[PDB]
Structure 1
C-alpha cells in the first residue's frame, strides 16, 4: 500500500491498547454505536494532522465507522506512538504517514502526502480533502501558504523569491520548519501551480484542536484571510477545562518522570504561563511536592496563581536559583540563551506549549563552542564553553508530555475527540452552505452548549457520577430547562 510508518509488526499491541483505552473513551464508543449504520460521514475525504497516539487511533476508527475515508499524519516530529500507527494500517482504515522521531524534512512531506488524494475518475488528477482535523494549524497553514505561493507565482511567472531564500524579512535565518515547508511548496508549484487553489473548491471546513491553532485562525478571520469554515474545538468547555488542564496535570508529570531523572519534591520549578495548561502543570507538580514559581504577563492569571499559594516572579528574578523550567505560554522567546547561561548546573528545561519556539533551542544548539551529548533518547545535555556549566533539555523543546511520554490519557482525549467528531459531522452536514460564488472568506465558530453538555453526559458513567435531576419548579426558579443547557453562554465554569 502507500502508508509510511515505522513497523507494521507492532499492530497487535496497538489494537489491544485501543480496546483497553475504549473502556474510558465512552464518548467515542457511543458515537460509533449510534452512527455506524447510518454513516453520516459517507463520501467525506478527511485529512488529519494530529499527534497519532492510541487515543487518536480510536478517533480515526470512529470517523471511519461513520463513513469517512481518512489520510493522517502527526502534528509533531516526536509525538507518534508507532504501535498506534501500525494498528490503523493493519486494519486498513486510514492511509498513515507518521512515525516517532521524524526529521523536520520528513514531517512536511508526510503532511503534504496526507493532504494529497487520488481522483477516482482520473488517474492523472490529484485532489484534496473535503474536511480537515487539525491540531496546531499546520494543515491549515500549508493550505493557505500554498494558495499565497500560487498567486505570487502567477504574478511574476516564476518561483517567488521568498521560497528560495534561507533568511526572513529581517535577515535572520528561517526556522527549519519554514524552510522545510517552503521546500514542499516549491516542489508543488513546479508540478502543478493550481494544486492548492484546486483543493479549496472542495474544502468544506477544518476543526481545530489547540490554543495555538485557534490563535492562527483568529488572526486569519480578523483580516479576511480564512478561506474555509472553521470550528474551534479547543474552546468547547469539555475540551479546554479538561484536556488542557487536567490532561497536563497527569501527562506533564509522566513526561518529566521519563525525561528527568531527578526527584521533583522540594525543587523550585518555574511554570511560565498560568493559563489553562499552566494551571494543570502547577497542580500536578505541587501534588508531588515541588515548590512552583509562576511567571505571567496577565495580571488576572498572576492573581489566580497567588490565590493557590504560588510565588509570581519575572524569570530573571529566579533564573539562577530554580531547578526546573517548564514553558506553557504559547508565546515565543520566553526562555532565551542568555537565561540558560545563568542557570545552575544541570538545571532542566522543558516545554509543554504546542511549538518549540517558547525556548530558543536553535540559539542553544548553535551557541559558539556549545558541547552536546545525548543523555537518553530525546534528552540532551548542553555545556557552555566559558563556564563549563550544563543545562538539560527535554526532547529539543518540543511538547514534553507527547515527546518524552504518551500524551494525555484516554478519558480526557475521548472528551476532546467526541467534540472533534461532532465538529466534523457539523461541517459535513452544512457543506451546501459553502458557496464560493458568493463568499470566499469565512469565520470561526464553536459547538453549542447543548452538545458540550452532551459530551460530558457521555462520560459520567466512566467515573460512577450520579447526576441530580431538577424538579419542574426548581427549573422554573432558576429559569432553565430540566434538560439544559444549565448555564448562560458567558459562564466560565
Structure 2
C-alpha cells in the first residue's frame, strides 16, 4: 500500500555511496537532472516502473523524481534486485519500492500489482506512465482489462484464471499461474480496477527486444490500450547496452557462477544478434573458443567473418563445455540436448525469462537429482547416465542473477533514452482522448535525441568530436548539428 516492501533499510548508506560513484559515469542522467530539476517537466506524474532494481536503476528513479514525478517501483526479475539500491530509494523518499533479491514467483507478481496500485486522495487509481522492461507491467494491465470484460459478460470468474492447464493441456508457467492468481484476487475486490486505470494512462516506455515484440503484436491486432515508446531500438540503446553491456556483464556473471577457466573452452553462443555479438567478443577476449548457432543467414555470416565457427547445436552439444543462450526464443536448449552434454557442462541464459533453456523439463525430469552448488547455481544429475550439468540462475538472466548487470556508463545511455521517452509521453498527454481513440501505436525516439544521448556521454571518456565546416556539411548534405545519418543507417 503506502509503505515499501524491501529486505533491509539499513543497507541504504552503501546504496547511496554506490549511487554517487556510479554518477561519475552516468553523465546523461546527471545532465538531465541539472537541466530539468528546476522546471520539473514531469510534475504531477505518477510513474510505475518494472525494471531490475539495481544501483543504475536507482539513478534513473532519482532522475525521474528530480524531474517532479511521484514513483512506485518493482523489479522485472526475481533475482536482479540489489537490496542496497532499493534501500537507498526508500531511505531518501525517492520512491515506494516493492522489491528484493531472491523473490518467489508469487511475490514477484504481488509486488508488480502493488507497484501499479496508487491511492487517489479522498479510493484507488493507476499510474499515468509506465517504465517497463520485458513487458510484464504492460501484460498485467492488458490481461487485467480482458479479465474484467470476460467477468462482466458471464458474471463469473473466467475459467482460464482457475485452470492450472493451458489451451493445449500443458501446465501453465509459474509466471502465468501467479499473475492469474493476482488477477482473480483483484476481480473479487474491484472488477473495474484495470479499466479504471486506462482513463489516466498516457503511455509506456519499453526497454527490451522481447517487450517490444509483444507491443508490436498488440499494435497490429488493435489491442494496444496506451501509447508506447520502443526505447530498445534507439541506436544509443540496442547498439550499446545489448552489445557492450553484455560483453562485460556476461563475463562477470560467468566468473561468479562458473568456477572454471574460460580460456581454451568451447563455448557455444546461441544467437548472434546484438547480445550474442557482445558475448562473443568478451568470451574471445579471455581465450575462449566461441562456437555460434544462428537461424538468420545474415547473422551467421557476420559470425563467420569474425572468425567463429557456426554450427547447429546437435553437432557440438556432446563436445562443447559451456552453453550461453542469447536468442530471445524458446526451447533452444532442450532436455534431450542436456542429456548428451559432457560431465559438468555449464548452461546459462543471457536472453530473457527462463524458457530459452527448458528448465521446467530439467527440474521435472523423472528421477533427476539436484544440489545447490552455491547461491543461484544448481547441478542436475540424470539417473541413467549419472552425468551432470550445472545450471546458472535456474535459467534466468545470468548477468543480473549471478552478477550486478551492466555497468553504469551503458545503462546511463539506455536510461537517458527512458527519461526522454517518459518526458515525450507526458508532454503529449493532451492528445490522448479516450472518448475518441482507444487503440494506440508504438513509436521510437528521433535520431536528434538519439545523437543527443551520445553527446551527453562523450566527456566521460575524453572523446573529442570533430565539427563540420559549412562546406563539408553541404557536401555530405547534413546540418552541422545533425542528424548525420539517414533513418535506415545501421551504424
TM bucket normalised to smaller: over 0.9
Secondary structure at the aligned position of 1:358 is classed as: coil
> Do structure 1's residue 387 and structure 2's residue 385 form an aligned pair?
yes
1:192 maps to: 190
Matches within 5 A, 1:199-214: 199-214=197-212
The separation in 1 between residues aligned to 2:372 and 2:246, in whole angstroms, is 26
Secondary structure at the aligned position of 2:324 is classed as: strand
The separation in 2 between residues aligned to 1:194 and 1:357, in whole angstroms, is 33
2:344 maps to: 346
Matches within 5 A, 1:26-45: 26-45=27-46
Select which of 394, 397, 422 maps to 1:396.
394
Q: TM-score, normalised by structure 2?
A: 0.99
The separation in 2 between residues aligned to 1:451 and 1:126, in whole angstroms, is 36
- Measured after TM superposition, the shift of residue 153 of structure 1 is 0.7
The separation in 1 between residues aligned to 2:303 and 2:382, in whole angstroms, is 34
The separation in 1 between residues aligned to 2:267 and 2:359, in whole angstroms, is 20
Cα displacement string for residues 400-442 of structure 1 (whole angstroms, at most 9, x for unaligned residues) = 0000000000000000000000000000000000011111100
- Measured after TM superposition, the shift of residue 106 of structure 1 is 0.1
- Measured after TM superposition, the shift of residue 478 of structure 1 is 0.3
The separation in 1 between residues aligned to 2:274 and 2:49, in whole angstroms, is 24
Cα displacement string for residues 134-162 of structure 1 (whole angstroms, at most 9, x for unaligned residues) = 00000000000000000111111000000
Secondary structure at the aligned position of 1:357 is classed as: coil
The separation in 2 between residues aligned to 1:40 and 1:357, in whole angstroms, is 40
The separation in 2 between residues aligned to 1:71 and 1:65, in whole angstroms, is 14
The separation in 2 between residues aligned to 1:439 and 1:274, in whole angstroms, is 40
Cα displacement string for residues 435-488 of structure 1 (whole angstroms, at most 9, x for unaligned residues) = 111111000000000000000000000000000000000000000000000000
Cα displacement string for residues 356-384 of structure 1 (whole angstroms, at most 9, x for unaligned residues) = 11010011000010000000000000000
The separation in 2 between residues aligned to 1:152 and 1:319, in whole angstroms, is 46
Select which of 162, 169, 172 maps to 2:170.
172
1:457 maps to: 455
- Measured after TM superposition, the shift of residue 103 of structure 1 is 0.1
- Measured after TM superposition, the shift of residue 98 of structure 1 is 0.2
Secondary structure at the aligned position of 2:423 is classed as: helix
The separation in 2 between residues aligned to 1:126 and 1:397, in whole angstroms, is 37
The separation in 1 between residues aligned to 2:121 and 2:456, in whole angstroms, is 38
Secondary structure at the aligned position of 2:53 is classed as: coil
Aligned length: 490
Cα displacement string for residues 187-207 of structure 1 (whole angstroms, at most 9, x for unaligned residues) = 000000010000011000000
The separation in 2 between residues aligned to 1:439 and 1:300, in whole angstroms, is 40
Matches within 5 A, 1:233-312: 233-312=231-310
The separation in 1 between residues aligned to 2:7 and 2:382, in whole angstroms, is 35
- Measured after TM superposition, the shift of residue 2 of structure 1 is 1.1
- Measured after TM superposition, the shift of residue 165 of structure 1 is 0.4
The separation in 2 between residues aligned to 1:31 and 1:476, in whole angstroms, is 32
1:70 maps to: 71
Query: Structure 2: which 5+ runs fail to align?
Result: none
Secondary structure at the aligned position of 1:368 is classed as: coil
- Measured after TM superposition, the shift of residue 163 of structure 1 is 0.3
The separation in 2 between residues aligned to 1:401 and 1:30, in whole angstroms, is 28
Secondary structure at the aligned position of 1:441 is classed as: coil
Cα displacement string for residues 296-347 of structure 1 (whole angstroms, at most 9, x for unaligned residues) = 0100000000000001111111000000000000000110011000000000
Matches within 5 A, 1:360-379: 360-379=358-377
The separation in 1 between residues aligned to 2:94 and 2:374, in whole angstroms, is 34
Secondary structure at the aligned position of 2:355 is classed as: helix
The separation in 1 between residues aligned to 2:317 and 2:151, in whole angstroms, is 47
Secondary structure at the aligned position of 2:239 is classed as: helix
- Measured after TM superposition, the shift of residue 354 of structure 1 is 1.9
Secondary structure at the aligned position of 2:205 is classed as: strand
Cα displacement string for residues 264-294 of structure 1 (whole angstroms, at most 9, x for unaligned residues) = 0000000000000000000000000000000
- Measured after TM superposition, the shift of residue 74 of structure 1 is 0.3
Secondary structure at the aligned position of 1:93 is classed as: coil
Deviates further, 366-375 or 1-10: 1-10
1:412 maps to: 410
- Measured after TM superposition, the shift of residue 85 of structure 1 is 0.2
- Measured after TM superposition, the shift of residue 84 of structure 1 is 0.2
The separation in 2 between residues aligned to 1:315 and 1:67, in whole angstroms, is 51
- Measured after TM superposition, the shift of residue 226 of structure 1 is 0.5
The separation in 1 between residues aligned to 2:140 and 2:286, in whole angstroms, is 41
CA RMSD in angstroms comes to 0.5
- Measured after TM superposition, the shift of residue 355 of structure 1 is 1.2
Query: Structure 1: which 5+ runs fail to align?
Result: none
- Measured after TM superposition, the shift of residue 70 of structure 1 is 0.1
Secondary structure at the aligned position of 2:166 is classed as: coil
The separation in 2 between residues aligned to 1:361 and 1:430, in whole angstroms, is 43
The separation in 1 between residues aligned to 2:464 and 2:39, in whole angstroms, is 31
